[PDB]
From a paper:
Periplasmic binding proteins (PBPs) from bacteria undergo dramatic conformational changes upon ligand binding. We inserted cpGFP into the canonical family member, E. coli maltose-binding protein (MBP), at four different locations and performed high-throughput screens to improve the linkers and other sensor elements, resulting in relatively bright sensors with ΔF/F > 6. Finally, we report the crystal structures of two of the sensors in the maltose-bound state.
Typical metrics for quantifying local structural perturbation, such as changes in solvent-accessible surface area or distance difference matrices, identify residues for which the change in local environment is defined by the three-dimensional relationship between residues, but not their sequential relationship. Approximately 400 “XX” variants of linkers 1 and 2 for the MBP311-cpGFP protein were screened. We set up crystallization trials with MBP165-cpGFP.PPYF, MBP175-cpGFP.L1-HL, and MBP311-cpGFP.L2-NP in the presence and absence of excess maltose, from which both MBP175-cpGFP.L1-HL and MBP311-cpGFP.L2-NP crystallized in the presence of maltose. We solved the X-ray structures of these sensors to 1.9 and 2.0 Å resolution, respectively, by molecular replacement [Fig. 5(a,c)]. GFP-H148, meanwhile, seems to stabilize the conformation of linker 2 of MBP311-cpGFP.L2-NP by H-bonding the backbone carbonyl of the linker 2 Asn.
Residue numbers in the entry: -3 to 397, 415 to 476, 480 to 619
Write the structure that this text describes.
Amino acid sequence: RWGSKIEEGKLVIWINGDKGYNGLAEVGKKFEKDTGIKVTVEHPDKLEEKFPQVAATGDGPDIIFWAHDRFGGYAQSGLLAEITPDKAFQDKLYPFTWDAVRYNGKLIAYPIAVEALSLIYNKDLLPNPPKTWEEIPALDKELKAKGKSALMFNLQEPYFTWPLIAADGGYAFKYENGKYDIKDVGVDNAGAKAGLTFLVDLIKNKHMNADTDYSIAEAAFNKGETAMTINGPWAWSNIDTSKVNYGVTVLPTFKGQPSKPFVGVLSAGINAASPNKELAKEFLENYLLTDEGLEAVNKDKPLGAVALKSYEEELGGSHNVYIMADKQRNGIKANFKIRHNIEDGGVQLAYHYQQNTPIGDGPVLLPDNHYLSTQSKLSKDPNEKRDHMVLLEFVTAAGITKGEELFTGVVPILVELDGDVNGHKFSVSGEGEGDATYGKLTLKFICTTGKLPVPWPTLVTTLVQCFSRYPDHMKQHDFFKSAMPEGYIQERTIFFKDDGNYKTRAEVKFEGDTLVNRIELKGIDFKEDGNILGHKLEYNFNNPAKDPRIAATMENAQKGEIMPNIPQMSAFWYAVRTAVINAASGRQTVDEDLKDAQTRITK
Ligand SMILES: OC[C@H]1O[C@H](O[C@H]2[C@H](O)[C@@H](O)[C@@H](O)O[C@@H]2CO)[C@H](O)[C@@H](O)[C@@H]1O
């Protein structure tokens, strides 16, 4: 019918009231300073409901911030402009974040950050938080005797109860090669019913109240009245302020399975009715999606795991082994940072650089960018009198969403290392076994020359990533197994912060039916009284993340499932909100409530 009501030569931004809007307004101010384009940030109530209404009239903000789930219904209605970042810009964000903001293939928002719920706990009330939902009733009873509760969280919004509902099988819409079946809905299967029954049981047994909402839970946790809550990264600042000694960790399991929170990509979309689309583009691309821009928002209220690689590298500290194809060497490179705990406190950084080149001239898989997530545990064999290390490691590939035949069983491993650190020569032999099906390494190492002159934990990375578990969907990214049996050369430099460096070269290959890692290490420039040569590192491989809260967010997100963005998501949310609220409050049984939700969603 008519023209836009939105004013030219300025930007009006809507963002939710739980996000860092004062921080974003600081980015606005800098933009205004540089360009003369005034930026107003607003945080209206129920803004995800008000946008489609005002935007259809040709009105509303120039930019709207929300999790990516609602943007497909906006895009279906013609309310969002197709965005046009070029290849160079797109390469600056994780690929998977761009996929969250596609509607019929087209990019319709800029991803900003990847959000998942975690378990937030009070370390003074609960130094070891529960691994299982099932143990929380007894924990509540114990805490109640001391006038505290175990757990309070927002039961009024379905986003917060969904991790429990989905844990044993509930799902929103079924995904089947390419799209969501709008008629195959998982809110009323056995798994959803069991989660929602567990929640209702908590309320019947008086471990939770039906009326707990976002404000009540946050105030209870921040005043030290409940030992746990469930919330997202945006809430961490208010906790910081309260001075409660908190941790953020993996959500509890239910019937043995991880909780499955929905994964939201906070995203910024451009109103189709804005006459300021180029200015909005410049703001989001050249001001907000920069390290300085995300930091201003992040310092206000934490974003989580940001979409922008450069700033996620600064926040996250390169926790995982990050792998890239090195086409020139028909191989790969990798970098990552290990953090070794120092005995009476502190952390000793070890910056790792890596490259692998196949030995044989035969074909190998060159992967897309991805990472390996590694967990290691160190122990001692009480019968072993030589200086030694017992290692158990688990490794899995992630980071996107024939030699392999030599690894389908359990392979014996042998390791030989000749070292020279500041002229101090030493040798290590190891043996054990790898089970690539489970990503599992079990090994024992001995210093064959007497006392190891460096801490054992500093040699863990040097002492067979062919034993990583690459899931089905990622097998084409496994360079390591594809090199075998002839194998590969692996080279590293490892720089120890404020101290020396290791340079390593290894051949990793089958000799007969044994996987053998033969290594030469040279250490130069170390301090004799430093952490390494002075043996000041704790004996473990805890390798804590720079920010354990971000690590816990990504752990929970990988166990979760990306929100669909289909227009039917608004009927989904309404239907589950109603079913959960009803069931909690004793209106109808869990079965009837979830059945009504199913019927409403699929109509
Ligand atoms: O509870 C339903 C609601 O869940 C999600 O909203 C989250 C949002 O993603 C987070 O950024 C944060 O603000 O908490 C909200 C829950 O209160 C969906 O994104 C949203 O569309 C849906 O209605």
